[PDB]
Amino acid sequence: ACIESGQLRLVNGGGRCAGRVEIYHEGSWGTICDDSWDLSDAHVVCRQLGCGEAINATGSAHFGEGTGPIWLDEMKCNGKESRIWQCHSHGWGQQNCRHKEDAGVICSEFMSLRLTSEASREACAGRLEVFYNGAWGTVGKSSMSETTVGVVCRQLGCADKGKINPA
Amino acid sequence: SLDKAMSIPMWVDNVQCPKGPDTLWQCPSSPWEKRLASPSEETWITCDNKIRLQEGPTSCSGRVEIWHGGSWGTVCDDSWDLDDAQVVCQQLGCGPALKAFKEAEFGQGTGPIWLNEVKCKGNESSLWDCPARRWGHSECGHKEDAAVNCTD
Ligand SMILES: [Ca+2]
Ligand SMILES: [Ca+2]
Ligand SMILES: [Ca+2]
Ligand SMILES: [Ca+2]
Ligand SMILES: [Ca+2]
Secondary structure (H helix, E strand, O other): OOOOOOOEEEEOOOOOOEEEEEEEEOOEEEEEOOOOOOHHHHHHHHHHOOOOOEEEEEOOOOOOOOOOOOOEOOOEOOOOOOOHHHOEOOOOOOOOOOOOOOOEEEEOOOOOEEEEOOOOOOOOOOEEEEEEOOEEEOOOOOOOOHHHHHHHHHHHOOOOOOOOOOO | OOOOOOOOOOOOOOOOOOOOOOOHHHOOOOOOOOOOOOOOOOOOOOOOOOEEEEOOOOOOOEEEEEEEOOEEEOEEOOOOOHHHHHHHHHHHOOOOEEEEEOOOOOOOOOOOOOEEOOOOOOOOOOOOOOOOEOOOOOOOOHHHEOEEEEOO
């Protein structure tokens, strides 16, 4: 009957499965240094969130900039650990990196959506695309409610209402 | 000695310096003379190169070290690219850079770091002429010192 110690959040990504890595210790949230970080080091974090396996690992604060103090530095992990705490670390509060270089992960369950008709990757009047495991695909036309159309438009933001185009 | 010269008197001769004078004027020498100067007695000195490559298995390649403010300094890893590496080996006369390396994998840094965020168009003569954050204040870690290799 305990809320357990420490929590792992993915921020600034647009989904729960993809985001800049932030770790909860004490009453503060901190980021992970990007050095000695690879997809093998990202298998554990993607597993603990339940999303699954990792498809990319980002460094040099490409995903974003973290203001919180760095908790862990220079992590080397097998990739089969249940939680990031079992992965090797230099030590708590051993901040040798900086907010200039930050670490993030991209799991497999993260998804995105867009409409593309022609000559324009973002165009709110075109075929629908879905993004799964770093791949682009469409959904079947069969058995789609007009309400489902409405949510599609609301998600991307072309209009409050949309109408199915058979063409 | 370069052949082209302007015939002008040799002010002093036989300059002898002690250890660590700030400037020549601290070095005792013979009294001033306005004598006519023979072409041979004029002195030409070639100071060492402003930039040097260190700790590289090849002499031409290594970490990039720049003599600034009387001390040798390095270049940070921020915004470093292959085109930036073209300028440095253009100074040495070595061939164009084959690859650029980063995060001090080549060696651990030394000296006070001077330059950061170096931005070279690729045709610029010197990094000093290149636009970049100058005069230190880069606060890069020594693990961020940069190094490249170039054709011999
Ligand atoms: Ca780094
Ligand atoms: Ca590691
Ligand atoms: Ca470090
Ligand atoms: Ca860096
Ligand atoms: Ca640059």
